[PDB]
């Protein structure tokens, strides 16, 4: 624990400074330290935790994709110029990406999910759980991949059940969850029909109860609603 001796409030402050400086590794490290104090996170703090790790793993995924693309052109008829280098470096990125996902899922399992009381917060962490299993799924293989897919679905599905029961259809976390579960269906579980179905339903039910938009978060809600519509444009 490199953050064990620092005040919780100071860690939260430095996370925000790191965000402004676009130092997402540092930001993740500070928020990890804050979580390990053992207190629940406020809404604001949960968003910082998510933004930090989302950007870290996002950079790794992006790098993975670049290397994967390069590797496709190589090891091919016509482009006979192989060598182990591309694979090796891609596997290096892969291992680090797995390391970060495991860290996040570790924090969630110990100790954000069980300590959550609010229904909004429980869904938030279950959505996160689904997301970081999804990211593991994108680079996994074999029996490992199968276990990961099941864990992602199970986390997403429980999140959905709670969100349908406890949250209005325009709630940004509910919308964000359905959006990403939709992506899971399309990109991981190989179920594009269910991806389209969920995305559409979510959008239409948000529109049907647009009056439920919150003054505090309608910008988030409308943005996710647009993202749903954009994915539907691509997928159909």
């Amino acid at each position: 624990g490199a953050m064990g001796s620092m005040e919780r409030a100071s860690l939260i402050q430095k996370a925000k400074l790191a965000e402004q400086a676009e130092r997402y590794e540092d930001m993740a490290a500070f928020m990890k330290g804050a979580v390990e104090k053992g207190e629940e996170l406020s809404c604001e703090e949960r968003n910082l935790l998510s933004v930090a790790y989302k950007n870290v793993v996002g950079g790794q995924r992006a790098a993975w994709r670049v290397l994967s693309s390069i590797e496709q052109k190589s090891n091919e008829e016509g482009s006979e110029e192989k060598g182990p280098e591309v694979r090796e470096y891609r596997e290096k990125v892969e291992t680090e990406l797995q390391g970060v996902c495991d860290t996040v899922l570790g924090l969630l399992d110990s100790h954000l999910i069980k300590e959550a009381g609010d229904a909004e917060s429980r869904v938030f962490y279950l959505k996160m759980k689904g997301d970081y299993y999804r990211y593991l799924a994108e680079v996994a293989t074999g029996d490992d991949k199968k276990r990961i897919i099941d864990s992602a679905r199970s986390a997403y599905q429980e999140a959905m059940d709670i969100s349908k029961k406890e949250m209005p259809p325009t709630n940004p976390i509910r919308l964000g969850l359905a959006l990403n579960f939709s992506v899971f269906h399309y990109e991981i579980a190989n179920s594009p029909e269910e991806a389209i179905s969920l995305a559409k339903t979510t959008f239409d039910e948000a529109m049907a109860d647009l009056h439920t938009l919150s003054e505090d978060s309608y910008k988030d809600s409308t943005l996710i609603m647009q993202l749903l519509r954009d994915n539907l444009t691509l997928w159909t």
Binding site: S69, Q72, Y186, L227, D230, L234
Partner: peptide
């Protein structure tokens, strides 16, 4: 917003293409 939207579309498109 349109920047976030563009990024999203490109990321989501990557899967479809590759």
């Amino acid at each position: 917003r349109d920047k976030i939207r563009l990024n999203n579309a490109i990321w989501r498109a990557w899967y479809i293409q590759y």
